[PDB]
Amino acid sequence: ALRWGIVSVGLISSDFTAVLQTLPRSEHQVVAVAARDLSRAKEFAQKHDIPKAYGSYEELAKDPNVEVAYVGTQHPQHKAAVMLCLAAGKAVLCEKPMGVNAAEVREMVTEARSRGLFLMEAIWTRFFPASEALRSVLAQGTLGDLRVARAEFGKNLTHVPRAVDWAQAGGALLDLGIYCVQFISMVFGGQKPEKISVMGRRHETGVDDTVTVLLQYPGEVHGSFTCSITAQLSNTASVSGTKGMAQLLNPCWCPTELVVKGEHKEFLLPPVPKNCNFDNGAGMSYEAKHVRECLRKGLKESPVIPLVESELLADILEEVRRAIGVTFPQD
Amino acid sequence: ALRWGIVSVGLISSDFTAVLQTLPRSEHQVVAVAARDLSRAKEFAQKHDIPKAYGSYEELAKDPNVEVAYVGTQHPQHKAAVMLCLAAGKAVLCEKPMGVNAAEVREMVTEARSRGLFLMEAIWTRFFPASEALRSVLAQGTLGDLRVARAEFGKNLTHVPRAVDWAQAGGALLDLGIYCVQFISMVFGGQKPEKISVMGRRHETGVDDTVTVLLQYPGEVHGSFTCSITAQLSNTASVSGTKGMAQLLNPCWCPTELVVKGEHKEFLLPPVPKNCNFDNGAGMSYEAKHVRECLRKGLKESPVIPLVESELLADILEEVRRAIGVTFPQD
Ligand SMILES: CC(=O)c1ccc(O)cc1
Ligand SMILES: CC(=O)c1ccc(O)cc1
Structure with missing residues (x-):
């Protein structure tokens, strides 16, 4: 074991x-x-x-x-x-x-x-069967040549104490933006953006409130996302090319439904456990099983979230919050 | 008459x-x-x-x-x-x-x-009962203080001849982007953006293919939209603030459904006519009725799409396509 x-x-x-x-x-x-x-x-x-x-x-x-x-x-x-x-x-x-x-x-x-x-x-979203199925759709060319990706994650989290605390490095980007960046990065092969533009505003507790980002990716495709700790968003993520759109339905950060060109597919969560602190928490199993397989094959990292990509995701996120002036002591 | x-x-x-x-x-x-x-x-x-x-x-x-x-x-x-x-x-x-x-x-x-x-x-979308109801929600403060707006309109229109023709000034922006700009402008009181960022690419016939835009609006709120003549998008539009989201469902450019904080509301089209060239074409009645009321009151323009806003919408759209280099002889 x-x-x-x-x-x-x-x-x-x-x-x-x-x-x-x-x-x-x-x-x-x-x-x-x-x-x-x-x-x-x-x-x-x-x-x-x-x-x-x-x-x-x-x-x-x-x-x-x-x-x-x-x-x-x-x-x-x-x-x-x-x-x-x-x-x-x-x-x-x-x-x-x-x-x-x-x-x-x-x-x-x-x-x-x-x-x-x-x-x-532990970007758990990546191991959900619905995300895996989405990667497979991309690998198969099912959407044609790609054009644009999109993600959203915002909820009112102003009463969730550690979400909005400056001293816990909360804020929209570090709590929710991270899911948008990882999704966008995943759909475009983990490649480094050519350019980033950001607009957003601050929250009164010292963190970021609401932030939208435009990322230029190589080969003439781009992503945008929006995250927020005050404003509810649609909380879906999509990718589109010349032959259609694929979309992870709300909740996109722990997805159980994939829609590809109009066709719905549901991927049920494990049955247990049932009263998790966070929604769809049972889906943590997928990454747990993933760590075991990696260790069993003697890997020193995941091919699904390689360390070099975790570094890029952290570069992107920090560049984003530096663009709107949000700093932590650790910078 | x-x-x-x-x-x-x-x-x-x-x-x-x-x-x-x-x-x-x-x-x-x-x-x-x-x-x-x-x-x-x-x-x-x-x-x-x-x-x-x-x-x-x-x-x-x-x-x-x-x-x-x-x-x-x-x-x-x-x-x-x-x-x-x-x-x-x-x-x-x-x-x-x-x-x-x-x-x-x-x-x-x-x-x-x-x-x-x-x-x-003739921005017909503005007169649809669902758009009117959305303006009313905004006027009532129902979403709280606003944060962010979003719009999408893309379809594969590469076989629709005049959609992709350089000589008819087609392209994603002028055929579909216009609906995104007008929507974003509507939700933020017709105010002039403080800043615009654009990414997109060209189509081989001389027009724009796929374009995303970030607009900074006064009072620390922003919009983004994406339009495309090759990639299907979700074709919805939303606006969100501190107390929730309102959303015009697909088709957002001629909407019959408004979702406000989870609550759905349907607004049926007139019964006739039935085989229109374009979808939801019956909804053209709303603007026709609007022109008559304006003329009857002796107005020289619409308060709903004032000429000074048509000019701003045209400024925005031209700035957008100039940012990605797309020019027409008329410039
Ligand atoms: C912030 C976040 O990831 C989250 C997830 C599930 C919840 O039920 C509440 C918040
Ligand atoms: C381009 C456009 O506005 C449009 C509208 C309705 C259609 O059925 C097809 C295209």
């Missing part, structure tokens, strides 16, 4: 741990959990049936029983936790966005690379 | 004439028609029950029986036909886009203004 250690005990670690505990037991075991104090960790481990509990991440890094660490901390805390894990020899699945700016990402990627160890950013 | 004269006898003049012939007969009469030769005009007049037929537009301009002229010619032929009508004292409803660049529009607007005569661009 792939032996997992869970770093941090917040909402998203719950969902992930819960998902992992539904997988075949000869395939995945949750073996440890760390929090920033011992009691918060004993409670999670009791609630989630994990044999070992730690009051620091370093102690989990050092557990010779953990093979892969899941880093589910909040945005600014990923980098130091990932590095601890990599130094101690663990493969790492890091929550999104892997880092707060590009230099954090290069620094994690370089460590992983130099230590010969697996690192992946 | 408002006595109409029909300039040009192509597909769109058919639809319009057909619509006019369904209106209360004490409200509208079609009294003449002109074409570039007498036979093409006698045939249309026979087919459409119009008492008088002309082999030049000048002869229709000069008919003292016509009160308002409908100029349904192709893009490059609007300006000379409108001017003939205005010189001869007729009110004019001119098909979209009124002109091929901004100078054509200013020149028509100036003539209309100096002669004390009604001119309107």
